[PDB]
Amino acid sequence: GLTEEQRMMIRELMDAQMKTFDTTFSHFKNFRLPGVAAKWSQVRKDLCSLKVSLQLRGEDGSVWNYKPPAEIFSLLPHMADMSTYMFKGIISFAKVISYFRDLPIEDQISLLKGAAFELCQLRFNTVFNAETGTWECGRLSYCLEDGFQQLLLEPMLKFHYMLKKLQLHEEEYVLMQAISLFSPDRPGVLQHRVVDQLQEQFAITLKSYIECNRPQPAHRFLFLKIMAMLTELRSINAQHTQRLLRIQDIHPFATPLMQELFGITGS
Numbered sequence: 001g002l003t004e005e006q007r008m009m010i011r012e013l014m015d016a017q018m019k020t021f022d023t024t025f026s027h028f029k030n031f032r033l034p035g036v037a038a039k040w041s042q043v044r045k046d047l048c049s050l051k052v053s054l055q056l057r058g059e060d061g062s063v064w065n066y067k068p069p070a071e072i073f074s075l076l077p078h079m080a081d082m083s084t085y086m087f088k089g090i091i092s093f094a095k096v097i098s099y100f101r102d103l104p105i106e107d108q109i110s111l112l113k114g115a116a117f118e119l120c121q122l123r124f125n126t127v128f129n130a131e132t133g134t135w136e137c138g139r140l141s142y143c144l145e146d147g148f149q150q151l152l153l154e155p156m157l158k159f160h161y162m163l164k165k166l167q168l169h170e171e172e173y174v175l176m177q178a179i180s181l182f183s184p185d186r187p188g189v190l191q192h193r194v195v196d197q198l199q200e201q202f203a204i205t206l207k208s209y210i211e212c213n214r215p216q217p218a219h220r221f222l223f224l225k226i227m228a229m230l231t232e233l234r235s236i237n238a239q240h241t242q243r244l245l246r247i248q249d250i251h252p253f254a255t256p257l258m259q260e261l262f263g264i265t266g267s
């Protein structure tokens with residue numbers, strides 16, 4: 001059974017998610033759009049990107065469709081604007097949680113800087129359509145262009161397909177957000193003992209939630225599947241943070257908020 005303290009934990013996380021996650025993306029406006037030996041090998045590899053088409057449905061029924069060159073610099077401003085919009089909701093999600101507010105302001109910044117990418121992938125997975133390969137963001141749509149096995153070779157795209165195949169509830173998604181946010185091993189945290197105890201309570205609640213609501217054999221080892229996926233997300237987070245910071249050093253693109261979460265000072 002679920003204890004009252006565990007039911008209160010989920011209720012505060014779900015209430016935090018409802019107040020800070022605009023699932024319809026109705027407040028995402030005024031965003032930019034694409035215009036109308038070694039190291040060379042890394043620069044070429046970092047500037048690869050997936051072939052994703054963009055759709056913008058107008059309120060009057062009109063549709064704008066963008067198809068990328070069948071380089072990625074034309075797509076960086078728009079992706080940075082969506083990143084900032086997602087980051088604003090994530091930061092708001094953390095500051096409405098009582099457990100996060102009670103931490104020192106330096107540990108709040110350290111936790112947010114280490115989990116902003118992971119919480120963005122977790123929220124974006126809830127709007128991902130695995131059958132059509134499309135991220136439906138309100139009037140915006142991001143469709144993967146043509147196969148699937150070769151596209152599932154990229155770890156982040158493979159993470160999105162695997163996490164969607166688990167068919168998780170909204171409460172399980174918001175508990176992965178809490179486990180990722182309250183990571184005691186993030187660089188710069190000072191209250192590692194408090195954050196570690198909080199993460200363990202979030203993980204126990206997720207484990208108890210799965211056992212009390214998913215008795216089917218298809219959900220066997222589901223908690224361990226989720227924990228292993230959250231570990232892979234931290235590795236994707238560390239790998240793609242390095243890729244973006246190498247792109248920023250060549251072609252600056254990061255917004256002010258993205259610079260703060262990356263540690264960029266402006267020199």
Ligand SMILES: CC[C@H](C(=O)N1CCCC[C@H]1C(=O)O[C@H](CCc1ccc(OC)c(OC)c1)c1cccc(OCC(=O)O)c1)c1cc(OC)c(OC)c(OC)c1
Nearest residue numbers: 049050052075076079080082083117120124135142156157
């Ligand atoms: C928090 C950092 C951010 C990111 O992760 N965000 C934020 C934007 C949407 C969600 C997610 C993402 O990217 O979701 C996309 C799917 C949704 C999407 C698709 C195309 C878009 O536009 C054409 C777009 O526009 C909003 C949004 C995704 C999913 C899986 C693998 C992906 O890349 C794998 C790879 O190429 O290595 C990408 C990011 C910014 C980048 O530059 C500013 C970037 O440089 C390219 C990048 O590379 C990975 C990531």
